[PDB]
């Protein structure tokens, strides 16, 4: 939190360009970004100070975008390449379990699956607190 | 025949001043010196010999001062016969490894929409093989067919089961463009249509072209891939007499794509952060498919509903544009009914008693109406218990609960999910099993044996075997 | 005109107590 | 003896839920104006404030 | 739709000046205005691109003005005048039923009555769906 | 002010400005009284407040112009005052049938000098500017009444609400940043 | 009413000074501001049309610092500086008793103490309508 | 060492041109002319030998042409042993009318954050003597506390108690640093740490120093005391060996005074009218607070959040920056429970079997169990009536409504206003106590008992009195 706007932009792509170089050499790997809603914050405060129109609740105009070009790069090779692989595991927040928002819906729709986690549940002593009803894997 | 200069490159936006010619607007440029190839396109004319456009790749590597030439008409690509069983770009080239496409004409994407005096009156019914949209909702040849639904409902599965019900039975050729989705799902189409013979890669007997623009492309790519696949079809539809086919897969990312560029582009923003431009951008596109008297189109679109809400301005202008609309929710899924098709929700415009006889129009009506009716009676049975009710609406309630069941169906492409083998079910079957429903002749049966089946003569059957096993 | 109207099943809408408690009597 | 006991309780606890429902769609209706005319001003500041950077 | 906009801003008052010349010279006429919502959408584009201050949901700030003379039209005339007519019927279509939007709020305060419908009573058998509770002519 | 029921110039001795200023501290009256119209439910349950206002909450068929005229003729005959009508944003035809109203009551005449009233109109079909002057219009009439004469008025406004809409729209135009739910900066001075 | 913004925004400081004057003179005064709202409206008016970025209830940001400098004029002095005094009573209106609004709960964290009145009491009878429950003195 | 001529004053906001010798970013200059000590800082370059500055005083007076010098290095304060006792302002001068402060070396304001391999990861508990937080959220030492809360809610009567049941017994020293407070309150706590005996006045025996700038002050100021409590209170983590514990009230007066001078300084607002940069400079200055290898820093903050409202922007970007979360309700204040702490929405770091054991973990699981199923029924409750439920669930709300009296406890700060008399209760007690409630050996007496007692015997009694 103490590091530059710029570096926290930045950082989930220069760790997919390492996480790459296994998937091209036939070996596996996997990668985990933790609160991507904390990079669009830092997208944004730098964007403003480049004096460029803002958009909804002053996000840039195609913080879709942002995400769609990193999240499409995992994936699995035939035997022609290597037959290597890569996975992702992003994290996301939520204020009073609202999902109905601007950033999460962007995810929603660009992944292949979610597994929900609900306060009640935790509180009612099932832990993990995952909710079954909704879950999905595709 | 004229050479500009680059003077300004900001995200996806770049300008270039001329010294000789002015380009007109829709005008297609080329960049000098990339190993790949960089079309930009025009949109303005700021003065002082000058213009803004709007790039179709990747902007990085670009300098102040490099030189950029001018071709002289819009952007053009291969059309013909040649294109059958080939993948290709937003500017017609091939991403399937196999060559150039050889043809011997081009054509431009960008065209005008038919007049007045061209329009035809026909309507006739086309039969799919699904209960729901045979009985409430008749599809129409010719006509102009969408798909509303939110996000993890089953939009593309219904898409993939009409290719594979009708795509198969039919003369003509079919034409898929697929705008702003997944990879991986186009990876999945392509070896799909190998193994049923559609597409062949030895002989010359292939029935479907395919165009491609996924999400991981920048905006002014995903802007422009639907006049790409639709100049296509124009060509079977207009330079031969045949019907065509034509499915498109979320064209919201049609409009999505342009509010990406608008503020870059000096415009002052309309309600909920869309562009000042949106119904008549959407308007100018969609003109383009309709059936004239030289030809036919049949089209098939889906239509993304962002968080489940139907009053958003992206949903709301389409409703005007098509013949038929089926809408799915989410509330039925929950229930565990496939396809979760809204029945009180959809419309179509051949639901007429002139058209579709008297005796199917009085079958769909007394469905809806008892369907309306089973509402009312939940708020009852909130507050005071079940059994107090009366033994008519306990009957109302019974009947319409086995309604409810029989409208669920077993698809084909979905085996690996549900388990079961595919049904198809003709119209008159989907008639009769409804009335008899409705006269009351299966009132000493259980729920569960009108679930996941075909036609009528398989509860009964199931019927028997749940009694066998208990 | 002005205010809120109800409809037709709109406590099994709401998703409330009073939704599941209908459903599974 | 017992049935018109049965029948005089009933209606008292009938009035006594509709007092209570009364109570509770007198509050929301407060709510829901406050938020209304919140969502207004929310959505008027974005255009101007779009409007003026260019 | 194909149409450029100031076509479509332009095509009420032409069909309401050929039906002028009817109620000037002692006959009677009758006008349509199918879905008034467009023009005003229409008429907000370009607005927008002249560099017009904007207001509440983007409208303009004449908007009103735009719909009042239109709709002040239409009358009947005394014997003097020849005794000519002009009747016009409008039609608005409605989000989810909310009637306290920008534009209705506007018409409705200009003309002397509505005829209300809903879809709750058009799958209940009841057609035309009129819902004579919040109907009046005055 | 120039007359629009085609009857002729409207001669007169006298012009007045229609921006002026309120009175000063010193000419107010430091005492309540109340203004009795002879009627048995408003003068006994709301009496109302000379020199104050009234709000009057009501709707179409329910009575609204038989107490209005009932109201100019009993202050007319129990005080000796007259009075004046300002329609802010009015419709034509309820204007029409109004003013054709009036006449066979008896608070207007068309034959002789015995007329109780005056008539301002500011129609639909105006420019906001033209409909948001309408009640000073009006009230400058009856501030001659008042100042030149020594007798009590009385005022009526058709709608307080447009003449808001009509100044609200008048700042948009300007160019203004708007207030909270888009109402003029300007809302509690004007 | 019918004076001008800034003479509204100006008021309660001069009477502060003419009561300052008692405070150091070893007197006792006492200070009544009739209401702070019509003050922070006159003042969001004043804001606006300067062109400075709104904020919530398009209030600007420094309605906190325009009272806080204000109420914290009145103190006790010690002998050493005279003994003199100052005591102020402020006065808010609220709308349909909504107390966790912007102004009333801003002017809440300043005072030492407040006295509510209800409505339904004065209704009902109970004249002074004090609620014994809330008011408090610290 | 350069002379500059004031060319513009708008507000806080003040311009100034060099001829040559531009000053860098975060220097101090000096205005000439003046009766009171005025200080700018620099904080843009604007271009053609001009920059932008911010003003820590009033700027009333001020005349285009104006001379102003530099002075070639940040703010620098008296920072050693000799600050005990004595009370600063946002520029180090004493406001205590008692002299200068005579101190060895100086230290500036702005530093930099304690590097990655600094960190120390050892984990303690710390008793307070208050049941909730001890038995639901624990805290611990060299931790971070954070206190939520509305206005009239209750946090500074929180901090005046925990500070009489920690500070007290403490060996090592403490800091005080008040942001946008009252002064009247100040002065009460001058003058009740005088008398208590922590501030000695003839002798070099006191163990607290105090920063002060309330919200009496232009907004200049209020953005810049918090930095001048941390660096006195990190000389005496590095260069001393000792373990320091910082309180500081309503650290939110820090965010909004920036958002009043970031118009002025030509930015686009974000969102509810913040500045764009929110996160990264509350990050650059919560960093500090950390405790190293060196030492330890026990800190306990009172955030606000504006008209009761949790998804602001501003104590919404909070929860990162803490090891334990104590939320305040005005719903429980309505109903009398004192202290308004929500059992519901409290965390804490250290809870889990390993480090509290396992029957505390159990224990408190089970009453928060407890606690949530009841919250479950009260749309039925409120409607339909009591009448309607078995008899396991009118047991759960009888044990339920027991329950959430006994989490209240009389307070000693409190006792002048309430009549009643202080207790504080160890941890073995509480423990036991919520074990035997939850056995059910309680179901025979009344839930007004529970109501504002200490220890569990002290119920049965206030039962047997009130027969
Ligand atoms: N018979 C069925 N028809 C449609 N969807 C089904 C069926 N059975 C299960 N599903 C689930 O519905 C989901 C719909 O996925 P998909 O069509 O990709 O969503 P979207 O409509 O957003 O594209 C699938 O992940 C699948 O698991
Ligand atoms: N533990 C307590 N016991 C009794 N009253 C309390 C307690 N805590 C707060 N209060 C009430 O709250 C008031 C003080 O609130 P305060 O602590 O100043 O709130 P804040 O810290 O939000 O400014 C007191 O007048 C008192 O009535
Ligand atoms: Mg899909
Ligand atoms: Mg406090």
């Known amino acids: ?138 | 025949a004229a050479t500009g200069r680059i003077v300004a490159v900001i995200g996806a936006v770049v300008d270039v001043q001329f010294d000789e010619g002015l380009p007109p607007i829709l005008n297609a440029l080329e960049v000098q010196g990339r190993e790949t190839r960089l079309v930009l396109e025009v949109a303005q004319h700021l003065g002082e010999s000058t213009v803004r456009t709007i790039a179709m790749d990747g902007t990085e590597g670009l300098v102040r001062g490099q030189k950029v030439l001018d071709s002289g008409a819009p952007i053009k690509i291969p059309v013909g016969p040649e294109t059958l069983g080939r993948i290709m770009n937003v500017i017609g080239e091939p991403i399937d490894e196999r060559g150039p496409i050889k043809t011997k004409q081009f054509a431009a994407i960008h065209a005008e929409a038919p007049e007045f005096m061209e329009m035809s009156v026909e309507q006739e019914i086309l039969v799919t093989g699904i209960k729901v949209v045979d009985l409430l909702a008749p599809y129409a040849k010719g006509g102009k067919i969408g798909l509303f639904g939110g996000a993890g409902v089953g939009k593309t599965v219904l898409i993939m089961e009409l290719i594979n019900n009708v795509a198969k039975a039919h003369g003509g050729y079919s034409v898929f463009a697929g705008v702003g989705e997944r990879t991986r799902e186009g990876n999945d189409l392509y070896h799909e249509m190998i193994e049923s013979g559609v597409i062949n890669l030895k002989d010359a007997t292939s029935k479907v072209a395919l165009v491609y623009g996924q999400m991981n492309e920048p905006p002014g790519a995903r802007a422009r891939v639907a006049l790409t696949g639709l100049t296509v079809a124009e060509y079977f539809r207009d330079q031969e007499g045949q019907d065509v086919l034509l499915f498109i897969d979320n064209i919201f990312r049609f409009t999505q794509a342009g509010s990406e560029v608008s503020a870059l582009l000096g415009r002052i923003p309309s309600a909920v952060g869309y562009q000042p431009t949106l119904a008549t951008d959407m308007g100018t596109m969609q003109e383009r498919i309709t059936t004239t008297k030289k030809g036919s189109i049949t089209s098939v679109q889906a239509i993304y509903v962002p968080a489940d809400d139907l009053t958003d301005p992206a949903p709301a202008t389409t409703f005007a544009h098509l013949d038929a609309t089926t809408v799915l929710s989410r509330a039925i899924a929950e229930l565990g009914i496939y396809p979760a098709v809204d029945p009180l929700d959809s419309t179509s415009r051949i639901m007429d008693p002139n058209i579709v006889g008297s005796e199917h129009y009085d079958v769909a009506r007394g469905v809806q109406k008892i369907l309306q009716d089973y509402k009312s009676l939940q708020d009852i049975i909130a507050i005071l218990g079940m059994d107090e009710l009366s033994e008519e609406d306990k009957l109302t309630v019974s009947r319409a609960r086995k309604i409810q069941r029989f409208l669920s169906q077993p698809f084909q492409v979905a085996e690996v999910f549900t388990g079961h083998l595919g049904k198809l079910v003709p119209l008159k079957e989907t008639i009769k099993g409804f009335q008899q429903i409705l006269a009351g002749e299966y009132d000493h049966l259980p729920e569960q044996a009108f679930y996941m089946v075909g036609p009528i003569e398989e509860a009964v059957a199931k019927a028997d075997k749940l009694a066998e096993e208990h | ?25 | ?54």
């Open chain 4, 1 to 54: 003896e017992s049935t018109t006991s049965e029948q005089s309780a009933r209606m008292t606890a009938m009035d006594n839920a509709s007092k209570n429902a009364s109570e509770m769609i007198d509050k929301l209706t407060l709510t829901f104006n406050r938020t209304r005319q919140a969502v207004i001003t929310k959505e008027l500041i974005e255009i101007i404030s779009g409007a003026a950077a260019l």
């Open chain 3, 1 to 25: 005109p002005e205010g809120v109207r109800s409809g037709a099943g709109a406590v099994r809408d709401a998703g409330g107590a009073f939704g599941k408690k209908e459903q599974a009597d």
């Open chain 1, 1 to 138: 939190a103490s590091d530059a706007a710029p570096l926290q932009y930045l950082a989930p792509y220069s760790g997919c360009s390492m996480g790459e170089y296994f998937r091209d050499n036939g070996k596996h790997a996997l990668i985990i970004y933790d609160d991507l809603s904390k990079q669009a914050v830092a997208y944004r405060q730098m964007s403003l100070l480049l004096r460029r129109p803002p958009g909804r609740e002053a996000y840039p105009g195609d913080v879709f975008y942002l995400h769609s070009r990193l999240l499409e790069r995992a994936a699995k090779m035939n035997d022609a390449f290597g037959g290597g692989s890569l996975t992702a595991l992003p994290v996301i927040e939520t204020q009073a379990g609202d999902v109905s928002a601007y950033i999460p819906t962007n995810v929603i729709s660009i992944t292949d699956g979610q597994i929900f986690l609900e306060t009640e549940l935790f509180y009612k002593g099932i832990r993990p607190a995952i909710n079954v009803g909704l879950s999905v894997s595709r």
